Amino acid sequence: SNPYQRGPNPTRSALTADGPFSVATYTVSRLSVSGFGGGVIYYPTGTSLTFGGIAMSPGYTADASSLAWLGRRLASHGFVVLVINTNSRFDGPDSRASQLSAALNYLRTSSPSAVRARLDANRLAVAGHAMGGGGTLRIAEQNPSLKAAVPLTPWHTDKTFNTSVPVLIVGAEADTVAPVSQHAIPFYQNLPSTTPKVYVELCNASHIAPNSNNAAISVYTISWMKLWVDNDTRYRQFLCNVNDPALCDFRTNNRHCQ
């Protein structure tokens, strides 16, 4: 019996909409915290259970509202999710990594009463869009205690990350900001072969695909977090032997399937 298991037996359909958990929001002002620019916490309410934590970084010149739908989506399926604002909208990927670190420390140590009540501080993960995706890869390299990392259409000038943290990268086929050939695909291939890794490439998708309700991003982000943060093997079925018409490529070393 898995003590971290949450919600009913999943259907793919159920992972394309908000999950069974009611979502509370807490606005963290940038002057209320050090090491990052505050943001919005999406967390389960109407429940006495504890859940894993996710720090999520938006991309260059973007704010927390650019990943609001996904923070809510993940929270609704049973996670405490802090979508950060950066100290500056112009902060680079390695700056975003440091702020994700401060955000994770904040959630564990100085988050509001209702948030701490729902958080299992032992089970933490990271995700991010673009330069935020770059930051996600960097913090994974720095913090091997993290359960999972989901870089969404990630951007970074460095291509090789020495992380053991399970990584699922979402590439957008027609990305002109972070071209998959220069960013996402190199990141995937340059990850250690012993690191549980998945690459999904969205058919004819743009760089901003992760900034609005996206069925595929929903399915793969929820499933990866569920499998690694909660040890919930009910979500293997969505990450193993995948034939998804929304994907124009799917790659994995298949370490997560048994």
Short mmCIF file of C-alpha atoms in Angstrom, two decimals:
data_model
loop_
_atom_site.label_atom_id
_atom_site.label_comp_id
_atom_site.label_asym_id
_atom_site.label_seq_id
_atom_site.Cartn_x
_atom_site.Cartn_y
_atom_site.Cartn_z
CA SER A 1 0.00 0.00 0.00
CA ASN A 2 1.49 3.37 -1.19
CA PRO A 3 0.92 6.00 1.58
CA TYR A 4 1.59 8.91 -0.92
CA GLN A 5 -1.08 7.66 -3.44
CA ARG A 6 -3.83 10.32 -4.05
CA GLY A 7 -7.11 10.51 -6.06
CA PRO A 8 -8.95 7.81 -8.08
CA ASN A 9 -7.57 5.43 -10.79
CA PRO A 10 -6.54 7.85 -13.59
CA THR A 11 -8.00 8.00 -17.16
CA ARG A 12 -6.10 10.01 -19.87
CA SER A 13 -9.33 12.13 -20.24
CA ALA A 14 -9.22 13.04 -16.47
CA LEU A 15 -5.56 14.30 -16.87
CA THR A 16 -6.67 16.84 -19.60
CA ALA A 17 -8.86 18.72 -17.02
CA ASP A 18 -8.57 19.96 -13.36
CA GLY A 19 -8.38 16.93 -10.99
CA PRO A 20 -10.53 15.91 -7.98
CA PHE A 21 -8.89 18.30 -5.40
CA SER A 22 -10.35 21.81 -4.76
CA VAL A 23 -7.56 24.46 -5.21
CA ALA A 24 -6.80 27.34 -2.77
CA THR A 25 -4.51 30.24 -3.95
CA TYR A 26 -2.02 32.30 -1.85
CA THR A 27 -0.41 35.42 -3.46
CA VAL A 28 3.24 35.76 -2.21
CA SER A 29 4.30 39.46 -2.62
CA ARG A 30 7.93 39.97 -3.86
CA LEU A 31 8.80 42.09 -0.71
CA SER A 32 7.50 39.28 1.65
CA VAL A 33 10.31 36.79 0.63
CA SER A 34 14.12 36.77 -0.03
CA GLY A 35 15.94 34.90 -2.87
CA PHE A 36 12.97 35.13 -5.34
CA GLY A 37 10.21 37.61 -6.41
CA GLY A 38 7.32 35.81 -4.60
CA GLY A 39 4.53 34.41 -6.85
CA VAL A 40 1.30 32.34 -6.42
CA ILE A 41 0.89 29.06 -4.41
CA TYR A 42 -1.81 26.66 -5.75
CA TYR A 43 -2.52 23.97 -3.07
CA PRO A 44 -5.30 21.47 -2.21
CA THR A 45 -8.13 22.61 0.17
CA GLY A 46 -11.11 20.64 1.65
CA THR A 47 -8.61 17.82 2.51
CA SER A 48 -6.58 16.65 5.59
CA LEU A 49 -3.99 14.74 3.42
CA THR A 50 -0.36 15.88 2.73
CA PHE A 51 1.07 16.23 -0.85
CA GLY A 52 4.46 16.67 -2.60
CA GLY A 53 5.73 20.19 -3.44
CA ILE A 54 6.59 21.69 -6.89
CA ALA A 55 8.56 24.95 -7.50
CA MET A 56 7.77 26.25 -11.06
CA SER A 57 9.67 29.08 -12.91
CA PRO A 58 8.20 31.08 -15.83
CA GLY A 59 10.41 32.14 -18.80
CA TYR A 60 12.23 35.36 -19.89
CA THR A 61 10.10 38.58 -19.45
CA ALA A 62 7.11 36.34 -18.36
CA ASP A 63 5.46 36.30 -14.86
CA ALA A 64 3.65 33.58 -12.78
CA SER A 65 0.34 34.21 -14.72
CA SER A 66 2.00 32.58 -17.83
CA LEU A 67 1.86 29.15 -16.00
CA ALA A 68 -1.28 29.87 -13.84
CA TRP A 69 -3.37 27.19 -15.69
CA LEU A 70 -0.62 24.52 -15.07
CA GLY A 71 -0.03 25.49 -11.38
CA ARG A 72 -3.84 25.12 -10.88
CA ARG A 73 -3.92 21.90 -13.03
CA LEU A 74 -1.13 20.20 -10.96
CA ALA A 75 -2.56 21.48 -7.59
CA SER A 76 -6.06 20.12 -8.57
CA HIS A 77 -4.51 16.59 -9.07
CA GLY A 78 -2.89 16.72 -5.57
CA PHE A 79 0.31 18.87 -5.32
CA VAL A 80 1.44 22.06 -3.46
CA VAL A 81 2.65 24.24 -6.43
CA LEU A 82 4.53 27.58 -6.04
CA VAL A 83 4.70 29.38 -9.45
CA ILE A 84 7.45 32.00 -8.73
CA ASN A 85 7.91 35.56 -9.99
CA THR A 86 11.67 36.28 -10.53
CA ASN A 87 13.56 39.20 -8.82
CA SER A 88 13.67 40.68 -12.39
CA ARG A 89 11.60 39.55 -15.47
CA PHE A 90 15.04 39.63 -17.29
CA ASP A 91 16.76 37.05 -14.95
CA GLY A 92 18.67 34.28 -16.84
CA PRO A 93 18.28 30.46 -16.49
CA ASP A 94 20.96 30.02 -13.73
CA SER A 95 19.38 32.99 -11.80
CA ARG A 96 16.01 31.11 -12.13
CA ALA A 97 17.75 27.92 -10.75
CA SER A 98 18.88 29.89 -7.61
CA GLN A 99 15.34 31.39 -7.17
CA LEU A 100 13.75 27.88 -7.56
CA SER A 101 16.18 26.80 -4.74
CA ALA A 102 15.01 29.76 -2.53
CA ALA A 103 11.34 28.97 -3.50
CA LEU A 104 11.75 25.26 -2.42
CA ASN A 105 13.45 26.37 0.88
CA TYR A 106 10.54 28.87 1.43
CA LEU A 107 7.83 26.14 0.88
CA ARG A 108 9.63 23.83 3.43
CA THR A 109 10.40 26.47 6.15
CA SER A 110 8.33 29.75 5.92
CA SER A 111 5.22 29.14 3.67
CA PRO A 112 1.77 30.06 5.12
CA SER A 113 0.06 27.86 7.81
CA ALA A 114 -2.52 26.26 5.39
CA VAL A 115 0.27 25.53 2.79
CA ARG A 116 2.64 23.78 5.32
CA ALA A 117 -0.38 21.68 6.54
CA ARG A 118 -0.76 20.21 2.96
CA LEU A 119 3.02 19.88 2.16
CA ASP A 120 5.21 16.77 2.68
CA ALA A 121 8.58 18.67 2.67
CA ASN A 122 10.44 15.32 2.00
CA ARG A 123 8.85 15.03 -1.53
CA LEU A 124 9.82 18.02 -3.79
CA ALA A 125 10.01 18.46 -7.62
CA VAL A 126 10.75 21.31 -10.12
CA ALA A 127 9.30 22.46 -13.49
CA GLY A 128 9.82 25.58 -15.65
CA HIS A 129 9.09 27.22 -19.05
CA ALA A 130 11.98 28.25 -21.41
CA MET A 131 14.77 30.00 -19.34
CA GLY A 132 12.73 28.60 -16.38
CA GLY A 133 13.21 25.16 -18.04
CA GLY A 134 16.97 25.92 -18.15
CA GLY A 135 16.78 26.78 -14.40
CA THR A 136 14.92 23.45 -13.81
CA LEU A 137 17.81 21.45 -15.44
CA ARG A 138 20.42 23.45 -13.40
CA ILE A 139 18.67 23.03 -9.97
CA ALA A 140 18.23 19.25 -10.74
CA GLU A 141 22.07 19.12 -11.22
CA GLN A 142 22.51 21.02 -7.87
CA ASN A 143 19.83 19.15 -5.77
CA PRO A 144 19.74 15.34 -6.36
CA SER A 145 17.18 15.02 -3.45
CA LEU A 146 14.51 16.39 -5.91
CA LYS A 147 12.01 13.63 -6.98
CA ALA A 148 11.47 14.92 -10.59
CA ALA A 149 12.17 17.82 -13.03
CA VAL A 150 9.92 18.86 -16.02
CA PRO A 151 11.65 21.45 -18.28
CA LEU A 152 8.93 22.84 -20.67
CA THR A 153 10.32 24.07 -24.08
CA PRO A 154 13.57 24.70 -22.13
CA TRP A 155 16.30 27.30 -23.03
CA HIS A 156 19.99 27.31 -21.84
CA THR A 157 23.40 28.15 -23.48
CA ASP A 158 24.86 25.14 -21.52
CA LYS A 159 23.72 21.80 -23.11
CA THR A 160 25.10 19.11 -20.66
CA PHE A 161 23.52 18.74 -17.14
CA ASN A 162 24.98 16.14 -14.69
CA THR A 163 21.69 15.23 -12.84
CA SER A 164 20.31 11.86 -11.54
CA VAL A 165 16.85 13.51 -10.95
CA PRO A 166 14.24 11.92 -13.30
CA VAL A 167 13.69 14.43 -16.21
CA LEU A 168 10.74 14.70 -18.67
CA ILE A 169 11.47 17.43 -21.31
CA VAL A 170 8.57 18.88 -23.42
CA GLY A 171 9.81 20.14 -26.83
CA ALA A 172 7.66 22.25 -29.22
CA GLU A 173 8.39 21.10 -32.85
CA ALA A 174 8.15 24.67 -34.35
CA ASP A 175 9.88 26.50 -31.40
CA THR A 176 11.88 29.51 -32.80
CA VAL A 177 12.91 30.84 -29.30
CA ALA A 178 14.34 27.52 -27.93
CA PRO A 179 14.69 25.33 -31.09
CA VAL A 180 14.46 21.61 -30.05
CA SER A 181 17.60 20.87 -32.24
CA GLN A 182 19.71 23.43 -30.22
CA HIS A 183 18.03 23.09 -26.73
CA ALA A 184 15.47 20.33 -25.78
CA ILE A 185 17.02 17.43 -27.83
CA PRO A 186 20.68 18.18 -26.85
CA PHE A 187 19.52 18.50 -23.16
CA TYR A 188 17.83 15.03 -23.39
CA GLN A 189 20.79 13.27 -25.15
CA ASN A 190 23.49 14.95 -22.93
CA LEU A 191 21.70 13.83 -19.68
CA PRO A 192 23.45 10.73 -18.19
CA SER A 193 22.17 7.46 -19.84
CA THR A 194 21.52 6.12 -16.25
CA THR A 195 19.13 9.08 -15.47
CA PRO A 196 15.43 8.14 -15.96
CA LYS A 197 14.54 10.52 -18.86
CA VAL A 198 11.64 11.10 -21.34
CA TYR A 199 11.46 13.50 -24.36
CA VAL A 200 7.98 14.39 -25.77
CA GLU A 201 7.83 16.69 -28.87
CA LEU A 202 4.44 18.47 -29.44
CA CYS A 203 3.40 18.30 -33.17
CA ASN A 204 3.59 21.77 -34.89
CA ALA A 205 3.58 23.56 -31.45
CA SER A 206 5.10 27.03 -30.70
CA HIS A 207 7.41 28.12 -27.81
CA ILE A 208 4.31 29.48 -25.91
CA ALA A 209 2.39 26.11 -26.02
CA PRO A 210 3.07 25.69 -22.23
CA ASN A 211 1.46 29.15 -21.43
CA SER A 212 -2.18 27.99 -22.11
CA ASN A 213 -4.37 24.87 -21.42
CA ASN A 214 -2.54 22.02 -23.30
CA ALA A 215 -3.87 18.40 -23.03
CA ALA A 216 -0.43 16.77 -23.77
CA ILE A 217 1.61 19.01 -21.35
CA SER A 218 -1.17 18.33 -18.72
CA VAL A 219 -1.01 14.48 -19.20
CA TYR A 220 2.84 14.18 -19.21
CA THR A 221 3.55 16.78 -16.42
CA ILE A 222 0.85 15.29 -14.06
CA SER A 223 2.00 11.67 -14.84
CA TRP A 224 5.77 12.37 -14.33
CA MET A 225 5.11 14.22 -11.00
CA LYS A 226 2.63 11.45 -9.90
CA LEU A 227 5.11 8.60 -10.75
CA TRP A 228 8.23 10.16 -9.08
CA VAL A 229 6.81 12.53 -6.35
CA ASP A 230 4.12 10.03 -5.09
CA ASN A 231 5.73 6.73 -6.36
CA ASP A 232 2.28 6.29 -8.05
CA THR A 233 2.82 3.48 -10.64
CA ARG A 234 -0.86 3.89 -11.80
CA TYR A 235 0.55 6.77 -14.00
CA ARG A 236 3.18 4.51 -15.74
CA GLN A 237 0.42 3.63 -18.33
CA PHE A 238 0.60 7.25 -19.74
CA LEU A 239 4.48 7.37 -19.82
CA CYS A 240 5.19 3.82 -21.24
CA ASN A 241 4.35 2.42 -24.75
CA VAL A 242 2.99 5.90 -25.74
CA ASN A 243 1.10 6.45 -29.06
CA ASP A 244 -0.18 10.08 -28.77
CA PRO A 245 -1.35 11.86 -31.99
CA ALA A 246 -0.43 15.24 -30.30
CA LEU A 247 3.27 14.04 -30.22
CA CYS A 248 5.51 13.98 -33.38
CA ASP A 249 8.37 12.34 -31.36
CA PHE A 250 8.63 10.31 -28.08
CA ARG A 251 12.04 9.11 -26.69
CA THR A 252 12.98 7.39 -23.35
CA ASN A 253 15.57 4.97 -21.81
CA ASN A 254 12.42 3.26 -20.31
CA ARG A 255 13.88 3.11 -16.71
CA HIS A 256 10.52 4.45 -15.29
CA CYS A 257 8.34 1.60 -16.74
CA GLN A 258 9.33 -1.10 -14.13
#
